[PDB]
Amino acid sequence: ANGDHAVTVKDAKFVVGPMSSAWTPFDNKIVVYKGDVYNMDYPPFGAGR
Amino acid sequence: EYKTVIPSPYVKCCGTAECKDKSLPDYSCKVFTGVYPFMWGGAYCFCDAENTQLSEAHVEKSESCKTEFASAYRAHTASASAKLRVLYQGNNITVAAYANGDHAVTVKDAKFVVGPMSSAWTPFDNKIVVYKGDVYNMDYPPFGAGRPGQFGDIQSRTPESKDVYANTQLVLQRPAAGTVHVPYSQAPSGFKYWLKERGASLQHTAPFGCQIATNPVRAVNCAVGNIPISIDIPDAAFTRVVDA
Amino acid sequence: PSVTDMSCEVPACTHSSDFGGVAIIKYTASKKGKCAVHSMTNAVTIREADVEVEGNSQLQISFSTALASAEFRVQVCSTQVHCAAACHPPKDHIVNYP
Amino acid sequence: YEHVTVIPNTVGVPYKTLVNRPGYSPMVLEMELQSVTLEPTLSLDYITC
Amino acid sequence: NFNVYKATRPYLAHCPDCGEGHSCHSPIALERIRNEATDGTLKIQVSLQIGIKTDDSHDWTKLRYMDSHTPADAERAGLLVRTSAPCTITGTMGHFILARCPKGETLTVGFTDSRKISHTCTHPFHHEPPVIGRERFHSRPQHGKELPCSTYVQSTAATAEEIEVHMPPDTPDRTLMTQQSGNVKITVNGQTVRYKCNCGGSNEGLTTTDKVINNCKIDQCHAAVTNHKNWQYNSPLVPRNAELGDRKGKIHIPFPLANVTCRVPKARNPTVTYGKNQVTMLLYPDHPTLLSYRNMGQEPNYHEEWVTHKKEVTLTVPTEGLEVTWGNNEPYKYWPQMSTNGTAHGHPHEIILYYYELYPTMTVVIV
Amino acid sequence: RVPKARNPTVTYGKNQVTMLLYPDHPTLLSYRNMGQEPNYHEEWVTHKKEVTLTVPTEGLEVTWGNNEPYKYWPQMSTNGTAHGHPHEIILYYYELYPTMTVVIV
Ligand SMILES: *[C@@H]1O[C@H](CO)[C@@H](O)[C@H](O)[C@H]1NC(C)=O
Ligand SMILES: *[C@@H]1O[C@H](CO)[C@@H](O)[C@H](O)[C@H]1NC(C)=O
User: Fold this and answer.
1) Is the CB of D30 less than 8 angstroms away from the CB of C47?
2) Known post-translational modifications (chain B)?
């Protein structure tokens, strides 16, 4: 859904996208554990509290 | 690059036979009527006006796709890195940091941290096509909507991706008098044209004198902006004016 | 098949999330044929997108909306049919599906 | 014809578009989304255990 | 150790151009040409088999070729391939030849069989090798840089390449039906011959020996050979088994390709003088070679040019340096120093001329 | 294998929802909106408690225990309003569009 994937089914062609809103429910720094994700601010490499 | 599989032409003797269609990559078929064969002993068949000939062809990937290919990529802004030498008490300590303000490196009780780059300029765009020693800021056709006779002649996600979309206008023509061969129309490709006119390489056309290096892609020496750099250091390396 | 003698009617309608309205259309198609039906305005919506028709008959459809006094132009095999309904509010306060 | 349309991002509801091609009987068609997924940037920083 | 071609036959193919003006049905006619090796090596699919005798030995100095519907043998020494210059035989395996070859509009292959009669076949094929790196040459240098490219290799046990092999349908040879006061004498020479006749009696059917079917003409009948023992690969030029599509059979198609380095030549270093924010480059050739230049401002301002002779070019340099690349050598960097002077601190004013170093013709608006 | 939770009893009011809920073990509850803001909220619970929630104009989601999310949605509520010789209209325009379209009155 970004406007560059033409795909056909029984010679019927579809082109979908790009999205009218490029907002995400994400911020940039994410911690991920094996089931879960969180928007937070981790300290960088080498500056561990 | 692609290979055109053309099997042996079906010679339907003394009558007609049409082809049962299938969803091959650019499956193309046509049965010509009223045709005539030729071999050692004249015509291959015995009937003359009732000889029909079924012809079918299609296109697949090549063996050269196993190792030689161009790649269409999407790309955006970068996580830069830097190598930084420091003469420190007459000692050449060289650090390697990530030039985005989110990496500090420690050496000899020294806490170096580079900043975010004051600009965010790259010489790149979104659609980037690479081949093996160079890159290009080119707009390839969208996947599946591949135009003929250029980039977009054949398309597939991976070399392991067994599905291959093609668009090359392989339409068969009427064979000649007696000459048993299969005339197929021309099929210009992306490699037949593009590798003769690659032109402006981004190694040679980079603004601000950056260089490129592949596997992985990396631009070096983009002389613009300015780097904030901070250092934390204890009082052990200093000395009081009572020693100065 | 083109169609003549169109006249619509509403038995009982309730504007809601469900199949809350029913409509009935008198019609006379020329012959047997599959054909489409489309809600011209955006307020009414038809579930059953296309049907088979034979000739002089009448047909029942189901529609959703939001307005009480649903005034309605509908294109069938292209022919504009007009209709009007005086719907009712539903009884349930809160349903789950959107 | 080629036809462009725009639909809301409501998953699991039929939207109806109409192909009003002249010279032809019109054709109504239904779109229903099952999933719309966004895969963000796979930029690892470090791990923690 | 690669003894797999036992169900094969080196058939004969309708070649459109054997020389001598018009077409033939040559035993040696080529079908499939490959030129994707970026050095320019040619992988040729030919209608013969080499290095294998009639008993399918590994005798890698001979060749099979069918003629008069019989696989006979000959010697690989007479083999010739030709675009414009006498080419070299490098890779020799069955239905496949590898050769490194110069320029040419056309290509042809030809050799002599075991009756001292030489035959050939010619196909127009726009074989011009692609340039590699940034240079061209008469030939390989014995010295230069190493640039990545791709070449064919010399393996015979190459997996994951396939073609389908199956039984060829018929062999119509009308040198058999002879009239003995208007008869037909089918002469089988120890075979299985199908016949098709527009007369009474044995009009259609099969026989095993030389028979006489009387009072009918030669063109009135049809005598084709039905081999049932050995197979051929699916050529696109042969007639098909005319009941359906592909009949079963399989062989692999070796001599694959791999990545390699290749010796790209150097570039003779040009000579260079300097001038007031500009540079004069006398540049020598060795062959038609390109050069390029840019600068390092906001825009790169690129230029690419080809040169062939002793060419002199003057290039002006802005304050952010200049970059000029020539040949496979390292791109030469340059940086505009204060030129020589305009002037020193003279006892008149005589000052603003060295103000024509830093910002010439702008910021004299302040004056 | 984690335990699931017992489905709670639930009824509705005009543009709101009352959910009476039965735990046995200490169990979370959470809810949010699907608008531009989440207005996210959560509570632990340990006893058989009722809760009241305000379903918005766009839709509410509640999640009790480990169950699949009980999603909820605003239907336009009821009829205390019709067409007659008086108006009987504004409760219509209290049901649809509260706090505005009374401004045009
Ligand atoms: C440090 O390295 C520089 C080259 O980067 C060299 O010129 C200098 O002499 C070195 N100093 C010491 C103390 O090693
Ligand atoms: C050959 O090397 C190139 C890079 O030098 C690489 O991209 C390609 O995948 C390699 N192919 C094989 C078959 O090793």
Assistant:
1) no
2) N-glycosylated.
